[PDB]
């Protein structure tokens, strides 16, 4: 019912959330209930149960948006504008904040092996500065790749510049530090979880980055 106000009926045919599926509903009942239980117990976001829960949240959310970042952004629009999303789904803004921070910890736990203490502390602080702007960029990268946009075109370079701004926001401006992050990406599959990125779109982006650099 709620999805009808936010997705076209064509989109509803491909949005798994809108499927009749008992297991999907049970899965989210568990994921929401377990998040609230950890929060009730004042579980820190860097506790292993929270990290594991948040990793599972992101896997499930990408599955149930059919890997479409524009469907993820649509859900976030919904959460802000639909009243009673707490009452309908159990998902609260405070719960998303918890999952967001726990998922960040899942990546900071890996970056710790690639960064020195100063770099890691910088990223722990600034990872959240512009985190919320990534889904919109990912959707635009998907569209550029789908439309066969030239990575060297002005608007392709606009996308590369946007990536750099968001990347430097969390990584800093030091070239040697940035090299560590890009090496970590190459070597750690988990660091591209919760991104809605595909190998095809990543390849397009890295071509656009190559032109820019």
Ligand X SMILES: COc1c(NC(=O)c2ccc(NC(=O)c3ccc(N4C(=O)[C@@H](NC(=O)c5ccc(NC(=O)/C(C)=C/c6ccc(O)cc6)cc5)C=C4N)cc3)c(OC)c2O)ccc(C(=O)O)c1O
Using CB under 6 A, list all residues that contact ligand X: 17, 25, 28, 32, 61, 72, 75-76, 89, 91, 96, 100, 131-132, 134-135, 138, 181-182, 185, 191, 194-197, 206
Nearer to ligand X, 21 or 118 (CB): 21
Mention every residue, 6+ apart, whose C-beta is less than 8 A from residue 67: 196, 198
Name the 3-class secondary structure at 98: helix
Q: Of 7 and 196, which CB lies nearer to ligand X in the complex structure?
A: 196
Q: Which is nearer to ligand X, 47 or 180 (CB)?
A: 180
Interatomic CA distance for residues 69 and 134, integer angstroms: 9
- Minimum separation from the CB atom of position 65 to ligand X (A): 9
Q: How far is the CB of 64 from ligand X (least distance, A)?
A: 8
Residue among 96 and 212 whose Cβ is closer to ligand X: 96
Write the DSSP assignment of 166-211 as a string of letters: HHHHHH-S-HHHHHHHHHHHHH-GGGGTTS---HHHHHHHHHHHHH
CB of 200 to ligand X, least distance (A): 13
Query: For residue 45, how far is the Cα from the chain centroid?
Result: 17
């Amino acid at each position: 019912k709620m999805y009808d106000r936010w997705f076209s009926q064509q989109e509803l045919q491909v949005l798994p959330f809108a499927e009749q599926d008992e297991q999907r509903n049970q899965t989210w009942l568990e994921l929401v209930g377990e998040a609230q239980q950890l929060m009730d117990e004042r579980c820190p976001a860097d506790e292993p149960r929270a990290i594991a829960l948040a990793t599972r949240w992101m896997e499930q959310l990408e599955q149930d948006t059919a890997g479409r970042p524009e469907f993820l952004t649509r859900l976030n629009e919904m959460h802000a504008a639909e009243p009673q999303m707490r009452e309908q789904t159990g998902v609260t803004p405070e719960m998303i904040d918890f999952i967001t921070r726990a998922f960040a910890e899942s990546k900071l736990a890996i970056w710790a092996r690639y960064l020195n203490d100063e770099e890691l502390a910088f990223t722990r602080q600034h990872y959240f500065d512009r985190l919320m702007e990534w889904p919109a960029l990912v959707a635009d990268l998907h569209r550029a790749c789908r439309e066969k946009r030239d990575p060297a075109s002005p608007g392709g370079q606009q996308l590369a510049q946007r990536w750099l701004a968001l990347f430097q926001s969390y990584a800093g401006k030091d070239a040697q530090t940035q090299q560590k992050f890009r090496y970590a990406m190459e070597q750690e599959p988990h660091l591209m979880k919760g991104t809605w990125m595909t190998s095809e779109v990543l390849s397009w982006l890295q071509q656009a980055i190559g032109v820019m650099m």
